[PDB]
Design a protein around this ligand. Sequence first.
Ligand SMILES: C#Cc1cccc(Nc2ncnc3cc(OCCOC)c(OCCOC)cc23)c1
Lengths: 271, 124
Amino acid sequence: MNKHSGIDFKQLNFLTKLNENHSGELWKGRWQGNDIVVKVLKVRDWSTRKSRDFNEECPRLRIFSHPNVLPVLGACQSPPAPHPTLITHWMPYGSLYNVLHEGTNFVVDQSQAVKFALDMARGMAFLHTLEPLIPRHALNSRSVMIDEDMTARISMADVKFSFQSPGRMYAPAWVAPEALQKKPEDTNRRSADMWSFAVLLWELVTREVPFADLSNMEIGMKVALEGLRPTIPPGISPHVSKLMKICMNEDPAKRPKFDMIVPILEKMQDK
Amino acid sequence: AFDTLFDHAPDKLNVVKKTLITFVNKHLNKLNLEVTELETQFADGVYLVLLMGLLEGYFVPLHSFFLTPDSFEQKVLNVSFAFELMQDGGLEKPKPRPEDIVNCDLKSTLRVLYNLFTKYRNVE
Ligand SMILES: C#Cc1cccc(Nc2ncnc3cc(OCCOC)c(OCCOC)cc23)c1
């Protein structure tokens, strides 16, 4: 018998549809006493091979051991489910992107921003201890969620799967220049994630979407081939400027590890 | 259908070609790329790949295709990959073989470009 049967799709209570796009559909729902989000994946040319792969990739996402990592609670295998499906907890504030850029009711203060940064650095340091690394995980403000106590958590449900096209990249503004150009197996993936964190620092400092005036194609091509970088913000402390510069080092090998910037960010907290 | 726009209205055909020209520059000029000649400038697959990302809102990592193809084979691979991106976006499998584009078949090229234009006229 299989080691995991996964979550039974029949047990999901679908309450309300949140979104639909190229990658699938998000629903708010309930499952075994949990308030959940369900992602129903859209896949072209689904096959037994891809289904087998989905069922081997999902167990790694069920990470319950770190406060700044949001687990996949489980997945529906397809077959027997209609479509490959992911389940995670509903995060009441939504993504970091939504809290920073689509927050119609309050503006988080810079003490909260520094706490988000520490939260994300702790979660990434934990993920970087895993062997092997969780593949195809891109750090950006849409893949970080804000829980009911304002804790920032890296979303494991936002990983890409092996059967989702690696040729289509939808948040290039957070991607390291080398990762725009080289296959993952030819990059240091941990150092690439630190570039993404540097861009998150920039986003927390400016409260702007990086390269908001450009299309994703323009962003990737200009960052990769024309040296386009975020403009260092005026009027910030030398300490924040220095941290953002080292995390965004052009040389991947000179960027700090997440476990090095965690104590730096701890000292930047109010508490 | 499109074959009648091609063969037996050659001043419509040229207006179709002038339509397709304005359309592709609207997007490729954002990368500082100009198209003056539909007969050849899509044959190596590069601009089709870039155009797909501009039309559907993604960047294509440069390791996914040959930005500077050095062989007929690499150009065929680029065009085939662009065809796959097209299907990812909801288009049915393109009629021409990828080699028809690489060989500068004006009909095969304008068919592919026209199907992109029908779908994406209104993208800014
Ligand atoms: C499985 C899975 C999976 C895969 C990828 C992404 C997510 N996204 C989310 N995951 C968890 N909680 C979410 C909460 C969300 O909203 C909370 C209310 O915000 C004010 C939310 O909003 C999406 C937009 O809705 C219109 C998305 C959430 C879930």
